[PDB]
């Protein structure tokens, strides 16, 4: 799996960024996306996809193990809608 470390090293090799600035930049990148979503804002990354917020109202649930009918509290969740460019790129891929 791709990790931050791997992403950092890649910026180092490809752009010559210092292993320190590279590491900080990767982290700031994900944090900035969380901040926007945290502030109720949509995040649209052209060529990749969109991180959208959806508000859900409580609905019927239960314990998968026991079966005790427990409700699913209402909540605001983050979703990702991959764009067409990215979808085309991975359609014929295969789990490595």
């Amino acid at each position: 799996a791709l990790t931050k470390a791997e992403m950092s090293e890649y910026l180092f090799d490809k752009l010559g960024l210092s292993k320190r600035d590279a590491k900080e930049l990767v982290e700031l990148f994900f944090e900035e996306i969380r901040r926007a979503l945290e502030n109720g804002e949509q995040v649209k990354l052209s060529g990749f996809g969109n991180f959208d917020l959806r508000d859900k109202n409580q609905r019927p649930g239960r314990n998968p193990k026991t079966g005790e009918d427990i409700p699913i509290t209402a909540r605001r969740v983050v979703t990702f809608r991959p764009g067409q460019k990215l979808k085309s790129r991975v359609e014929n891929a295969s789990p490595k």
Partner: protein, 93 residues
């Protein structure tokens, strides 16, 4: 917030890095993420989320506009699962 707006925000915060490098860095990270998925490998960033590929069986679909049948092949589609920190921080309720 769009990709350019994100780059603008990062640039301001990373004053020690030339705006240009930040922009090149963001474009590079996104390609590294897309490329990883195209290679059929997952992405797992603790506290943000993980991206994986979901399989879609072949099926007889339709051109929703005309109603004509279309034969679709099996395929894989990206899928994102938000992480704990992100779920919490995002959930206003």
């Amino acid at each position: 917030m769009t990709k350019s707006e994100l780059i603008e925000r990062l640039a301001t915060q990373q004053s020690h890095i030339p705006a240009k490098t930040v922009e090149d860095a963001v474009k590079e990270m996104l390609e590294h993420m897309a490329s990883t998925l195209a290679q059929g490998e997952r992405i797992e960033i603790r506290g943000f989320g993980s991206f994986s590929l979901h399989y879609r069986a072949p099926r007889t679909g339709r051109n929703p506009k005309t109603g004509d049948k279309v034969e679709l092949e099996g395929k894989y589609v990206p899928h994102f699962k938000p992480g704990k920190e992100l779920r919490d921080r995002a959930n206003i309720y």
